[PDB]
Structure 1
Amino acid sequence: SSGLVPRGSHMSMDYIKGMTWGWIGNSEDWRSNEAERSMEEMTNLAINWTAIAFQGLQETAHSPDITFAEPPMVTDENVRWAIAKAKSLGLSVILKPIVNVRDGTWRAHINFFDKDVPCEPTWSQWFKSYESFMLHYAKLAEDTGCEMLCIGCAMVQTERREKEWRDLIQKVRQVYSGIITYNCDKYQEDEVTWWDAVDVMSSSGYYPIGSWEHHESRIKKIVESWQKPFFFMEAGCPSRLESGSVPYDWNKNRGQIDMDEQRVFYEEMFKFFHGQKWFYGFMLWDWPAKLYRLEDASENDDYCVYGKPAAEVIKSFFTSNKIAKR
């Protein structure tokens, strides 16, 4: 394994100044002329990384089959395009294949019985399907020279399957030679028992306004106990009334615009998580393939910071000397 620095062959670890691009991963959106303009515009955040994020799908939280690279999901060609375009813009890339559930159930609920029973689908079946999905993209990440692969995102009810996760990572190592991360959910940084199996620890930093100092203290101790580099694989807040109290809640107060609430979230997050030597930055959430007009920004309720005060907080943080030296 390795400690604070991934082994040289997989590359100190780079400080991540990033923005997530492409969610939810719709072929028609990625293939549009608008996609190229969106990605170009995103570079004005002064980012040096992007997470190319897109979905795979399973019917229910308890079904074993995962479908990917089928309409309306992204084609391998769309993926190669996004990676290459990002690189052409001078960005390092984190490939982020994410399994969603067709019935709308949050992926964190994906789960099977601890004990295999004849009358139900098993962990073995699901992990075989998830391995097919993640190895497909791991091979794509290798072929396209992606600097990092995120092998999962907030798969809370799967994390206890340590043997299966280690087995999957071993297979990933065989086809992908870059940096591996797993993105645990918010509040779960101390719950993953197999952090030693990945190069870099990562979590979703959707911590509420007024809690960042507390979370810095908590996370710092967890990271120090693992001796691994750590960064936020997701961090953001919608521009809506009271969203800073629940930054992860994408359904909170839809259409109730509050630019200032998003701005305050970003100022507090960067106040407590900045240039500490154990911390390796931010993959922000998020930026769409089809971006709204700058003139509609003041009435937009999304996580996107484009044309909003938060974008300026991000830009000044990512161009500031303390962060630019990292």
Structure 2
Amino acid sequence: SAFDLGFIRGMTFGFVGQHGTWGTDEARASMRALAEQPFNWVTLAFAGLMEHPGDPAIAYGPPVTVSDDEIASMAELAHALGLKVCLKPTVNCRDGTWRGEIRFEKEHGPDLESWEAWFGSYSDMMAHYAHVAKRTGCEMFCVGCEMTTAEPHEAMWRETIARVRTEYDGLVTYNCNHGREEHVRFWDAVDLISSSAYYPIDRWRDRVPVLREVAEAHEKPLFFMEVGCPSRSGSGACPWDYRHPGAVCLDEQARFYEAMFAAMPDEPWFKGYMLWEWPWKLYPREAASEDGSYCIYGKPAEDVVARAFSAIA
């Protein structure tokens, strides 16, 4: 199931999944371009919104996010184009606080500003989208992304995952942040270990042994639910940073992909790459030189990825 999952050659699509954006002509065209790349997977990623990082409320569905029908439309299109589909609901905060830093005054209390209450809201959201994933035939479901502060609430994560399993029969992953692979204590509750592997160029080769050790320790395959780099100067030193000041630099993004592919071994514990990311509104190829985003389309990284992925299979 997980052990002989085909190696993942994937791309994340459509973040942050603002309401209505995936039902556009642009989105459908962008998806068609995505499916012409040597990818076997797409991740449909979107974010619900927290009013603040200590408020347990989460806003999702219309008018904030893509509707359930928009999700179904994109999944149906991806599937019709021969892609496998991972559904990835997550949360952002309106004030810009990183989702990995949410925190509550209290551990318990359904009506208090508590971890219990937040997990209630979050489990409600994940259960809803896990059900959408099952009905739309999505081959994977990602139960969380980069939730560093939430991770120590192990029993609450296991409750959330158990509920997802009631609603969804496919592969389940949790996506931790880079540097958290060895720290998460509930990997046994998921099928695949994954991370947001935004390792600086210089750090790849030294990090690989720990990634191997984590996979082998937990007897689970490991893959990258996010990995990528903006085409901006200096970005390979801070590939996670989407607001890095700098000149457009296509070569820097290529250097990141070269370093990553050179570092990762051809070993069975590693199950591949969910690249970050592809926009719902895709620029024409000729405009790639003015683009400072994570998108590889029309840049030298597209060819680096092509050379690696076509040869992988």
After TM superposition, the score normalised by the length of structure 1 is 0.93
Secondary structure at the counterpart of residue 293 of structure 2 = coil
1:298 to 276, 285, 289: 289
The equivalent residue for 2:119 is: 127
TM superposition shift of 1:67? 1.3
The equivalent residue for 1:186 is: 178
Taking a change above 3 Å as real, the CA distance of residues 78 and 274 of structure 1, as seen in their structure-2 partners, is: farther
- 1:100-249, aligned counterparts within 5 Å? 100-113=92-105, 115-116=107-108, 120-249=112-241
Determine the C-alpha separation between the residues in 2 that align with 1:50 and 1:67. Answer: 24
Matched, 1:282 2:273: yes
Which residue identity does 1:250 align to in structure 2? Answer: Y
Determine the C-alpha separation between the residues in 1 that align with 2:137 and 2:21. Answer: 23
Matched, 1:36 2:10: no
Structure 1 gaps of 5+ residues are none
Secondary structure at the counterpart of residue 149 of structure 2 = helix
TM superposition shift of 1:119? 9.7
Which residue identity does 2:12 align to in structure 1? Answer: T
Which residue identity does 1:183 align to in structure 2? Answer: N
**Is the 1:28–1:72 Cα contact (8 Å) retained in structure 2?**
no
The equivalent residue for 2:250 is: 259
The equivalent residue for 1:314 is: 305
Determine the C-alpha separation between the residues in 2 that align with 1:116 and 1:149. Answer: 27
**Is the 1:45–1:314 Cα contact (8 Å) retained in structure 2?**
no
The equivalent residue for 1:80 is: 72
The equivalent residue for 1:51 is: 43
Secondary structure at the counterpart of residue 59 of structure 2 = coil
**Is the 2:106–2:112 Cα contact (8 Å) retained in structure 1?**
no
Secondary structure at the counterpart of residue 20 of structure 1 = strand
**Is the 2:20–2:70 Cα contact (8 Å) retained in structure 1?**
no
Which residue identity does 1:30 align to in structure 2? Answer: W
**Is the 2:87–2:140 Cα contact (8 Å) retained in structure 1?**
yes
**Is the 1:237–1:265 Cα contact (8 Å) retained in structure 2?**
yes
Secondary structure at the counterpart of residue 158 of structure 1 = coil
Which residue identity does 1:313 align to in structure 2? Answer: V
TM superposition shift of 1:114? 5.6
**Is the 1:135–1:175 Cα contact (8 Å) retained in structure 2?**
yes
The equivalent residue for 2:260 is: 269
Determine the C-alpha separation between the residues in 2 that align with 1:135 and 1:118. Answer: 18
Structure 2 gaps of 5+ residues are none
**Is the 1:149–1:181 Cα contact (8 Å) retained in structure 2?**
yes
The number of residue pairs the alignment matches comes to 313
TM superposition shift of 1:190? 0.6
**Is the 1:274–1:281 Cα contact (8 Å) retained in structure 2?**
no
The equivalent residue for 1:60 is: 52
Determine the C-alpha separation between the residues in 2 that align with 1:227 and 1:102. Answer: 38
Secondary structure at the counterpart of residue 202 of structure 2 = coil
Which residue identity does 2:22 align to in structure 1? Answer: W
TM superposition shift of 1:120? 4.7
Could you give the per-residue CA deviations for residues 143-198 of structure 1, whole angstroms, max 9, x where no partner exists? 01100000000011000000000111111111100000000001110110110010
Determine the C-alpha separation between the residues in 2 that align with 1:55 and 1:115. Answer: 24
TM superposition shift of 1:55? 1.0
Q: Which runs of 4+ in 1 moved over 3 A?
A: 113-120
Report the identity percentage. Answer: 44
Determine the C-alpha separation between the residues in 2 that align with 1:76 and 1:118. Answer: 27
